[PDB]
C-alpha cells in the first residue's frame, strides 16, 4: 500500500495577545475590571495558536483537534473587529509547504497582516495532518479503513475549500503551495485515496466482484485525472506524479481483474481471458516503469495464474473466441466518496472564546 500525504506548513511564533489587548476598549468602556475577561481569554487563543501551529507533531486525533479548534476560533474572531477596514496590527509569516528555495540563502515565505491568510494556511495544515493520519492507518482492519476514508474526504474538502477561497481571502499573490492550482490537485489526490479505501474495504469484506470492479474503475478515473494535473508541473514532491501514474494503472487492472471474475462466473470465458490480458499488460507496465514506488508482484502472479488456467481450459474445452477490448462493454463506475464541506465549527465540541462579543 503506497499512500500520498502532505507535509505541514511552517509558521513563526507571533504574540497574538499584545495586538488584541489594545483593540478591545472603544464604546465598550469597562476600563476598570471587566475587559480582563476578553483578555485572559484572548490569550488562551494565543497559546492555542502556539499549540496548533507550534510543535513538531503528534499524528493523532490530539494534535488534529487542536488545529481544527484553532481554525474554528479564527473564523469566529473575524467580524468582531470589523475587518473590512483592517486596523489591528498583526503579521503572520508562513513558509511554502513544498518549495525548497535555493540553498542560495533560505526558503520561500509569505508575511501578511491578514486573518484571511492565517485561516488559509491553518486549514492547509488541518488537511495536511489529516492526510498524514489517513496514510498511517492499518488498512488490514475495519476501523483503520474507516478512519483513513473519513480523513481523506476531510482533507479533500479542506484543500478544496482553500481553492475556492485563497484569492478572495488574501490580498497578495499566494505562495504556490496554497494557490488554487496546487490545492485543487491535492484535493483530487485525497479524494482518489478515499475511493481506493472504499475499494479496499469491499475487498476485505469479500464483497461481490461486480461491485469491487466499479469501485476500482472510479478510483482509476480519480487517479487518472490527478496525474494529468501534475504532468506538466513540478510543484509537488517528485514521488507524487509516478505514484499517481502507477495507481491509475493498478486501479484499471483491479477493475479488469474483478470484472474478469464476473465473466467467468457467467461462463464468458473468452471475455475472461481478454480482461485478464489487459490487466496483465497494465501491471507489467507498472512493474517495469514504476517499481521503485510500488510492489505489484503478488497481483501480477495472481493474474498470471488466472490467465494461464483460463487459457488452458479455453484451448482444451470451450474454444470461446477471445474478443477485442474495444468490443467489450465498459466497466461501470461507483463513487462512494465526497469532498467534506468546511462548515464551522469543524472541531469537536467547539465553544467560541469571544461568544458574547
Amino acid at each position: 500500500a503506497t499512500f500520498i500525504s502532505v507535509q505541514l506548513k511552517k509558521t513563526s511564533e507571533v504574540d497574538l495577545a499584545k495586538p488584541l489587548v489594545k483593540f478591545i476598549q472603544q464604546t465598550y468602556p469597562s476600563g476598570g475590571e471587566e475587559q480582563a475577561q476578553y483578555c485572559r481569554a484572548a490569550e488562551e487563543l494565543s497559546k492555542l495558536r502556539r499549540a496548533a501551529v507550534g510543535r513538531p507533531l503528534d499524528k493523532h486525533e490530539g494534535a488534529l483537534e487542536t488545529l481544527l479548534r484553532y481554525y474554528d476560533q479564527i473564523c469566529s474572531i473575524e467580524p468582531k473587529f470589523p475587518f473590512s477596514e483592517n486596523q489591528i496590527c498583526l503579521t503572520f509569516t508562513w513558509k511554502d509547504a513544498f518549495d525548497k528555495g535555493s540553498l542560495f540563502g533560505g526558503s520561500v515565505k509569505l508575511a501578511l497582516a491578514s486573518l484571511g491568510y492565517e485561516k488559509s494556511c491553518v486549514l492547509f495544515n488541518c488537511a495536511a495532518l489529516a492526510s498524514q493520519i489517513a496514510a498511517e492507518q492499518n488498512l488490514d482492519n475495519d476501523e483503520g479503513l474507516k478512519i483513513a476514508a473519513k480523513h481523506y474526504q476531510f482533507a479533500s474538502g479542506a484543500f478544496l475549500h482553500i481553492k475556492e477561497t485563497v484569492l478572495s481571502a488574501l490580498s497578495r499573490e499566494p505562495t504556490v503551495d496554497i494557490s488554487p492550482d496546487t490545492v485543487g490537485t491535492l484535493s483530487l489526490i485525497m479524494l482518489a485515496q478515499a475511493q481506493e479505501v472504499f475499494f479496499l474495504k469491499a475487498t476485505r469484506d469479500k464483497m461481490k466482484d461486480a461491485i469491487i470492479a466499479k469501485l476500482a474503475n472510479q478510483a482509476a478515473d480519480y487517479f487518472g485525472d490527478a496525474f494529468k494535473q501534475c504532468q506538466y508541473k513540478d510543484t509537488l514532491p517528485k514521488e507524487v506524479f509516478p505514484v499517481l501514474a502507477a495507481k491509475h494503472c493498478i486501479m484499471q487492472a483491479n477493475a479488469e481483474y474483478h470484472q474478469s471474475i464476473l465473466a467467468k462466473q457467467q461462463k464468458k470465458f473468452g471475455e475472461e481471458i481478454a480482461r485478464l490480458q489487459h490487466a496483465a499488460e497494465l501491471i507489467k507496465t507498472v512493474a517495469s516503469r514504476y517499481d521503485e514506488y510500488v510492489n505489484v508482484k503478488d497481483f501480477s502472479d495472481k493474474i498470471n495464474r488466472a490467465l494461464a488456467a483460463a487459457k488452458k481450459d479455453n484451448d482444451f474445452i470451450y474454444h470461446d473466441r477471445v474478443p477485442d477490448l474495444k468490443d467489450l462493454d465498459p466497466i461501470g463506475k461507483a463513487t462512494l466518496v465526497k469532498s467534506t464541506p468546511v462548515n464551522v465549527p469543524i472541531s469537536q465540541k467547539f465553544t467560541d472564546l469571544f461568544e458574547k462579543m
Binding site: K146, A149, K150, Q153, F198, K201, A202, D205, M207, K208, A210, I211, A334, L336, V337
Partner: peptide, 18 residues
C-alpha cells in the same frame, strides 16, 4: 443483483457512519 443491493447499501451505511 440481490447482493449488489446488499453490498452497495452496506458501504453507503459505512459512509454515513463517519
Amino acid at each position: 443483483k440481490e447482493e449488489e443491493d446488499d453490498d452497495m447499501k452496506e458501504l453507503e451505511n459505512w459512509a454515513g457512519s463517519m
